[PDB]
Amino acid sequence: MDDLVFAGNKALYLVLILSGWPTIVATIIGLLVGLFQTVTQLQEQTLPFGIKLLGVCLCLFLLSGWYGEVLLSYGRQVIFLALAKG
Amino acid sequence: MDDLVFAGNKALYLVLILSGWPTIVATIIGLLVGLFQTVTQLQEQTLPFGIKLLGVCLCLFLLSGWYGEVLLSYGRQVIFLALAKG
Amino acid sequence: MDDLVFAGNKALYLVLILSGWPTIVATIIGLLVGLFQTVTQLQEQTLPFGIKLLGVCLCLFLLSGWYGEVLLSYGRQVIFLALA
Amino acid sequence: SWPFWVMHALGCIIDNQRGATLSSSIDPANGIDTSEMANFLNMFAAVVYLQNGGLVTMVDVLNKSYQLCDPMNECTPSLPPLLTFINQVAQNALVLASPVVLVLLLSEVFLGLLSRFAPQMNAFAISLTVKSGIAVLIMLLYFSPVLPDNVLRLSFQATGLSSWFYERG
Amino acid sequence: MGNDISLIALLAFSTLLPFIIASGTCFVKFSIVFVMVRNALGLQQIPSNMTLNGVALLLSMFVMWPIMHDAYVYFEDEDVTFNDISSLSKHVDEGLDGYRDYLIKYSDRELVQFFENAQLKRQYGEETETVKRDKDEIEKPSIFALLPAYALSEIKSAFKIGFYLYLPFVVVDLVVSSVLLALGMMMMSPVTISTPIKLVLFVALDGWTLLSKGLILQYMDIA
Amino acid sequence: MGNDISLIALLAFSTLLPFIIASGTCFVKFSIVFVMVRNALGLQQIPSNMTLNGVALLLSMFVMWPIMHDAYVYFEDEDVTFNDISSLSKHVDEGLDGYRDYLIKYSDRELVQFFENAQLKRQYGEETETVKRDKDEIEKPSIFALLPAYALSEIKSAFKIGFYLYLPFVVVDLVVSSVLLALGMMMMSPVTISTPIKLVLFVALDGWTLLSKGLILQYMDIA
Amino acid sequence: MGNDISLIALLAFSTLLPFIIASGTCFVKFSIVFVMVRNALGLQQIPSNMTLNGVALLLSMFVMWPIMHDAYVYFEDEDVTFNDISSLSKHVDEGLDGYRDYLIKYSDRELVQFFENAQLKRQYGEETETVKRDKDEIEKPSIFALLPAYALSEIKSAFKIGFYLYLPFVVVDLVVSSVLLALGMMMMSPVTISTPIKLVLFVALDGWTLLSKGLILQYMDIA
Amino acid sequence: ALSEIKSAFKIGFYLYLPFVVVDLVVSSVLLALGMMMMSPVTISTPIKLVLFVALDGWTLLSKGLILQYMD
Ligand SMILES: CCCCCCCCCCCC[N+](C)(C)[O-]
Ligand SMILES: CCCCCCCCCCCC[N+](C)(C)[O-]
Ligand SMILES: CCCCCCCCCCCC[N+](C)(C)[O-]
Ligand SMILES: CCCCCCCCCCCC[N+](C)(C)[O-]
Ligand SMILES: CCCCCCCCCCCC[N+](C)(C)[O-]
Ligand SMILES: CCCCCCCCCCCC[N+](C)(C)[O-]
Ligand SMILES: CCCCCCCCCCCC[N+](C)(C)[O-]
């Protein structure tokens, strides 16, 4: 039982960790560009998209490795919990 | 797995550069037409869209040959890697 | 594959033309009413929406005969290119 | 089925509030439109139920259904209680989902208020970046009560057969 | 042993049963109204199609099961005797009147009469229709004439009902939008606010219960 | 019973029956029309396909029955027994004329003739030319030519109808948006208001009765 | 029958027919093209797959029948009786050439040769060739080599045709979406309006006639 | 029969959890870019395949399933 609760909790915890950094940078870029467009009055609306695409892709390059190490370790763990009973 | 690493990273780099050019053109046009409305102090919704459409269509007429070269090259390359072991 | 290349280029050309006119009519109406607001000034947001609708509707009502002929010609042309 | 349909509804409400409209697909085994969260919570309920031995209560209620109302006596489901059923399921689901809907509403109004000082800020687009993280963060806190909430309080019991069925013969 | 043709008729009937139910029974109406109301509340997949179809099916049985049971009780009746194909046909037809009456009650006389003409009049060299005085034909429209005329009337009734249920939700949408504008809190999409409100309001008033009663009371008395 | 080969033929026919109904009968048209109407109203699950196809099948039965009855009576006739292959084959052929003549009214002449040209034995030069008199050519093209031309022409005529059905709803959908823009509520989705209007319009128009009647009138003649 | 083994072979072939039709006949092409048409029009349910496949099978019948007939007329001659294995084997072999021609007309020889060299174990299955030398390879190639090449060669062709058929409708979609942006009606989904335009466009082109004719003309030629 | 169904379902549950993570992550990054019209399944399917291949699932799984029946 507690193994079930633990594994289910951890799933949500990993979602949170992995998704957190891209969504942070997409937020910060959204705020900065929105402010800049009030500091100098320009009514463009694709500029956020153009910048935040580069912003998100860059950090996907950076974190490409840790993403695979975390998921491998988790998969091995849950396969053990499922099968290794005696 | 240097092969999986290569094919995975190149896919994302190709997305970033294939998509960048239209969005750059659209953004620069957007800014200039937004400015001109300010120095003229004259305002309407439709002029920027109208010009943006033409700008993107010209961008595609020009570059599209190179889009084909890049995609064919990648298409062959991945197949050869998949069936490389034999 | 000259035929395939041609078909492709023509597609974009057709979209650029067939969308062009209505956007020009809407642009000109919006601009002209905009300037007309600067004199005798009263500032209202909806007048461009009210009038451009009539502009575009009347444009389509006049030209819609043309559109079908252009489209038909293109469709026949590509069907033949394919089945040859 | 009653404990599972509530968790499925809960998951559908969350995935709708956080955007995510397009993610769903129709399950071929049942013909039901299934989101990403809904499938997860629907499995997780099943496993805790099986672990608690509900499987015994299922055969139990079956046997009792035969002892208390017999094929030859024309046993029939009661009409009056059946008429409430859909609304009790919807009630339970809403009552349980509410805490997340509230926080996500406050979040979006807060951003809209903030927009007043910087009218070029796309407060809508910002909310799409934020709300999915908020949703998972909050549900992670109120996650552990999910195990007791469903396992006992929602599971059907053999004692209820008396009210839902009677003999017409 | 029994009779080898009545055996064929039994097995055949049991294969067609779900299509009859799906096309000539109040299931047609119940399954539609629920799904419409679900769309109007603006949140698909709550309740599930499984829940809705299951309930609609159960309710349809209260209306229809007595009629079938009455028909079998009519046929299991050891005191009859026959002499000819006509005398048997009449008695078998008489057995179906219990169902025929239900279809006649819930369907349009003129569309029924139209199909009753259309089965024949490609045969006919004539325009006169009086040639049979009504009292037989008004009682005995054929079942194949009644079926599609019934289904086409059930659908229309369903739409009539659902129309009136849409109105209040529309009103609620207009109110929300007008408030956001009057506050100037413009750049927020109203749907995000109004779908919670619609849900909570309808559940807090038990719309589904009132709806279920209002549907059944066309066909039964619950007491 | 009878000639062993006639028995085989009867069973083969009855095995292929549903593909014929699905490919050479008005069922093709009615099936399409009802689904297009559902899409025009904008409903994704109401009514079920199992209801719509049931109605379409019943409506088709009226139109097709008289031909099946006439052909049956024509073959259940002891009049003759046959001396020769040519006498038998021309007796068989004369029984299908009722169906052949049904297909001829609706398939299109030019496509029919093209398919008949297609069947002839190939030649090394382009085929030797011919023109043939009406009693073959107008009266009696072969069924293996008529059948696909029929299917194709029916599909086309169905799409045509669907086109007209869409127009009034398109009008509604535009008008409602323009009025919401005139009121400034630019952010509200108009689907939430246009859908019920469409339903109201369809019930007040009583579209089901009109469609069901007129579709039959295209084939039957009723007075 | 005069030979028990001839009987066995005939029945076996009759049992394999549907897989040969589905893998070595123009049915492969015609089946695909119609489904792509339906997708490009954006229709989910209609027409039915068995309607489309029925038409595809009828059309393919015209194209393939001449070969079946030629082979039947060739084989039914008992005009010679056979001294030996090789005499029989050659007599049979020479009968398939009417089919072998048709496969070799449309497959692409570089595959055919690649497979030939593969089913033989030769030179460890693949080796380089210094010299390129063509050996009336048209008569050498086994049918078991020809069949896959034909299948792949013709699937590809179908995809090509479907590509060309999509373009006109894509134009319509982008045009509608642009004029709606010109009006500023940014909230409204084009699919409510663009569909009927596609329908009328296809009806005016009469795409079924042109399409069906051209498909046949690729294989036959007719006045 | 019901005991084996229970335990097989139990084992099957555990195996979902990585792929569930994959799916929710992909959906979040697409919404962060605003590409609401992209069906995630197209992107998430290959990530699942390569994940399972990297685990070597069938080896681990077929080993453990047999070791449960013999010491
Ligand atoms: C629009 C992009 C959505 C991407 C969602 C998946 C993120 C992980 C991508 C794989 C790991 C990073 N990398 C660079 C190797 O691709
Ligand atoms: C969407 C989750 C993030 C992307 C990574 C998914 C796991 C891919 C497989 C990792 C393999 C790691 N590696 C190369 C060391 O084996
Ligand atoms: C273009 C978006 C989707 C790209 C998906 C690429 C998947 C790469 C999987 C391996 C990632 C981990 N890595 C690089 C260590 O192997
Ligand atoms: C109206 C938009 C149409 C987009 C698709 C057009 C067809 C694909 C482009 C074909 C030509 C490719 N190219 C330029 C490399 O030859
Ligand atoms: C608004 C149209 C969007 C089309 C997106 C794809 C663009 C690249 C491929 C089509 C290129 C067409 N071209 C320039 C060869 O004619
Ligand atoms: C963009 C709105 C107007 C689109 C009009 C396009 C019509 C295409 C169909 C042409 C049919 C010509 N026809 C058959 C009426 O003569
Ligand atoms: C639920 C379908 C299977 C059982 C058949 C039920 C037949 C209807 C009985 C209704 C009795 C209602 N009552 C007591 C008010 O008459």
PDB file of C-alpha atoms in Angstrom, chain E residues 67-168:
ATOM      1  CA  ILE E  67     -46.125  -3.962 -23.004  1.00  0.00           C
ATOM      2  CA  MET E  68     -43.924  -6.876 -24.040  1.00  0.00           C
ATOM      3  CA  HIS E  69     -44.919  -8.912 -21.012  1.00  0.00           C
ATOM      4  CA  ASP E  70     -48.582  -8.257 -21.787  1.00  0.00           C
ATOM      5  CA  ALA E  71     -48.053  -9.541 -25.307  1.00  0.00           C
ATOM      6  CA  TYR E  72     -46.480 -12.806 -24.190  1.00  0.00           C
ATOM      7  CA  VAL E  73     -49.272 -13.264 -21.663  1.00  0.00           C
ATOM      8  CA  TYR E  74     -51.672 -12.821 -24.574  1.00  0.00           C
ATOM      9  CA  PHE E  75     -50.013 -15.550 -26.632  1.00  0.00           C
ATOM     10  CA  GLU E  76     -49.625 -18.110 -23.801  1.00  0.00           C
ATOM     11  CA  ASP E  77     -53.357 -18.789 -23.723  1.00  0.00           C
ATOM     12  CA  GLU E  78     -54.558 -22.371 -24.062  1.00  0.00           C
ATOM     13  CA  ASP E  79     -58.219 -21.744 -24.983  1.00  0.00           C
ATOM     14  CA  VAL E  80     -57.972 -20.431 -28.557  1.00  0.00           C
ATOM     15  CA  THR E  81     -58.819 -22.369 -31.697  1.00  0.00           C
ATOM     16  CA  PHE E  82     -58.306 -21.616 -35.387  1.00  0.00           C
ATOM     17  CA  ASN E  83     -59.495 -22.876 -38.754  1.00  0.00           C
ATOM     18  CA  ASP E  84     -57.588 -21.062 -41.499  1.00  0.00           C
ATOM     19  CA  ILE E  85     -54.653 -18.849 -42.383  1.00  0.00           C
ATOM     20  CA  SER E  86     -56.961 -15.840 -42.129  1.00  0.00           C
ATOM     21  CA  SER E  87     -58.239 -16.755 -38.673  1.00  0.00           C
ATOM     22  CA  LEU E  88     -54.648 -17.149 -37.498  1.00  0.00           C
ATOM     23  CA  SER E  89     -53.411 -13.921 -39.078  1.00  0.00           C
ATOM     24  CA  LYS E  90     -56.184 -11.979 -37.363  1.00  0.00           C
ATOM     25  CA  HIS E  91     -55.302 -13.384 -33.947  1.00  0.00           C
ATOM     26  CA  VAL E  92     -51.595 -12.699 -34.352  1.00  0.00           C
ATOM     27  CA  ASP E  93     -52.260  -9.144 -35.505  1.00  0.00           C
ATOM     28  CA  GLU E  94     -54.609  -8.647 -32.572  1.00  0.00           C
ATOM     29  CA  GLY E  95     -51.720  -9.566 -30.307  1.00  0.00           C
ATOM     30  CA  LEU E  96     -49.668  -6.514 -31.436  1.00  0.00           C
ATOM     31  CA  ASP E  97     -52.368  -3.879 -30.825  1.00  0.00           C
ATOM     32  CA  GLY E  98     -50.923  -3.122 -27.389  1.00  0.00           C
ATOM     33  CA  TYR E  99     -47.774  -1.795 -29.087  1.00  0.00           C
ATOM     34  CA  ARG E 100     -49.627  -0.294 -32.032  1.00  0.00           C
ATOM     35  CA  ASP E 101     -51.639   1.899 -29.644  1.00  0.00           C
ATOM     36  CA  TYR E 102     -48.476   3.326 -28.079  1.00  0.00           C
ATOM     37  CA  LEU E 103     -47.059   4.249 -31.471  1.00  0.00           C
ATOM     38  CA  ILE E 104     -50.379   5.808 -32.522  1.00  0.00           C
ATOM     39  CA  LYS E 105     -50.507   7.888 -29.353  1.00  0.00           C
ATOM     40  CA  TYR E 106     -47.046   9.418 -29.838  1.00  0.00           C
ATOM     41  CA  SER E 107     -46.914  10.169 -33.602  1.00  0.00           C
ATOM     42  CA  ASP E 108     -48.428  12.306 -36.354  1.00  0.00           C
ATOM     43  CA  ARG E 109     -51.591  11.167 -38.092  1.00  0.00           C
ATOM     44  CA  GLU E 110     -50.829  12.862 -41.381  1.00  0.00           C
ATOM     45  CA  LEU E 111     -47.284  11.625 -41.818  1.00  0.00           C
ATOM     46  CA  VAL E 112     -48.559   8.153 -40.943  1.00  0.00           C
ATOM     47  CA  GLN E 113     -51.269   8.500 -43.565  1.00  0.00           C
ATOM     48  CA  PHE E 114     -48.734   9.695 -46.125  1.00  0.00           C
ATOM     49  CA  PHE E 115     -46.611   6.577 -45.751  1.00  0.00           C
ATOM     50  CA  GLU E 116     -49.769   4.460 -45.723  1.00  0.00           C
ATOM     51  CA  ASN E 117     -50.509   5.875 -49.158  1.00  0.00           C
ATOM     52  CA  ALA E 118     -46.932   5.520 -50.344  1.00  0.00           C
ATOM     53  CA  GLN E 119     -46.802   1.786 -49.711  1.00  0.00           C
ATOM     54  CA  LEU E 120     -49.567   1.301 -52.307  1.00  0.00           C
ATOM     55  CA  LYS E 121     -50.246   4.211 -54.613  1.00  0.00           C
ATOM     56  CA  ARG E 122     -47.461   3.401 -57.038  1.00  0.00           C
ATOM     57  CA  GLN E 123     -49.876   0.544 -57.815  1.00  0.00           C
ATOM     58  CA  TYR E 124     -52.952   2.685 -58.248  1.00  0.00           C
ATOM     59  CA  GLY E 125     -54.754   3.922 -61.364  1.00  0.00           C
ATOM     60  CA  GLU E 126     -57.012   6.256 -59.390  1.00  0.00           C
ATOM     61  CA  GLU E 127     -57.250   9.337 -57.183  1.00  0.00           C
ATOM     62  CA  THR E 128     -60.189   8.497 -54.894  1.00  0.00           C
ATOM     63  CA  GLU E 129     -59.210   7.624 -51.314  1.00  0.00           C
ATOM     64  CA  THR E 130     -62.649   7.490 -49.643  1.00  0.00           C
ATOM     65  CA  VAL E 131     -63.042   3.979 -51.108  1.00  0.00           C
ATOM     66  CA  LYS E 132     -62.529   2.547 -47.634  1.00  0.00           C
ATOM     67  CA  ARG E 133     -64.424   4.256 -44.830  1.00  0.00           C
ATOM     68  CA  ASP E 134     -61.997   5.358 -42.201  1.00  0.00           C
ATOM     69  CA  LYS E 135     -63.004   3.254 -39.202  1.00  0.00           C
ATOM     70  CA  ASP E 136     -60.874   0.268 -40.246  1.00  0.00           C
ATOM     71  CA  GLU E 137     -57.844   2.069 -41.682  1.00  0.00           C
ATOM     72  CA  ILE E 138     -57.630   4.687 -38.912  1.00  0.00           C
ATOM     73  CA  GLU E 139     -57.351   1.824 -36.431  1.00  0.00           C
ATOM     74  CA  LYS E 140     -55.058  -0.264 -38.588  1.00  0.00           C
ATOM     75  CA  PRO E 141     -52.108   1.679 -39.901  1.00  0.00           C
ATOM     76  CA  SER E 142     -49.324  -0.817 -40.468  1.00  0.00           C
ATOM     77  CA  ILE E 143     -46.403  -0.998 -38.072  1.00  0.00           C
ATOM     78  CA  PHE E 144     -43.878  -0.311 -40.807  1.00  0.00           C
ATOM     79  CA  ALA E 145     -45.868   2.834 -41.508  1.00  0.00           C
ATOM     80  CA  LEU E 146     -45.892   3.791 -37.841  1.00  0.00           C
ATOM     81  CA  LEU E 147     -42.204   3.270 -37.059  1.00  0.00           C
ATOM     82  CA  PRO E 148     -40.459   6.040 -39.034  1.00  0.00           C
ATOM     83  CA  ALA E 149     -43.315   8.433 -38.371  1.00  0.00           C
ATOM     84  CA  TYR E 150     -42.764   7.849 -34.668  1.00  0.00           C
ATOM     85  CA  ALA E 151     -38.999   8.296 -34.743  1.00  0.00           C
ATOM     86  CA  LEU E 152     -39.238  11.508 -36.745  1.00  0.00           C
ATOM     87  CA  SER E 153     -41.635  12.916 -34.178  1.00  0.00           C
ATOM     88  CA  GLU E 154     -39.581  11.926 -31.172  1.00  0.00           C
ATOM     89  CA  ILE E 155     -36.509  13.743 -32.453  1.00  0.00           C
ATOM     90  CA  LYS E 156     -38.499  16.930 -33.038  1.00  0.00           C
ATOM     91  CA  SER E 157     -39.879  16.744 -29.504  1.00  0.00           C
ATOM     92  CA  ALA E 158     -36.361  16.385 -28.117  1.00  0.00           C
ATOM     93  CA  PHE E 159     -35.198  19.547 -29.883  1.00  0.00           C
ATOM     94  CA  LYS E 160     -38.262  21.436 -28.687  1.00  0.00           C
ATOM     95  CA  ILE E 161     -37.407  20.571 -25.087  1.00  0.00           C
ATOM     96  CA  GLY E 162     -33.672  21.303 -25.283  1.00  0.00           C
ATOM     97  CA  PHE E 163     -34.293  24.701 -26.855  1.00  0.00           C
ATOM     98  CA  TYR E 164     -35.941  26.020 -23.685  1.00  0.00           C
ATOM     99  CA  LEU E 165     -33.101  24.678 -21.544  1.00  0.00           C
ATOM    100  CA  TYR E 166     -30.462  26.626 -23.470  1.00  0.00           C
ATOM    101  CA  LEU E 167     -31.933  30.101 -22.740  1.00  0.00           C
ATOM    102  CA  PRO E 168     -30.931  30.597 -19.066  1.00  0.00           C
TER     103      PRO E 168
END
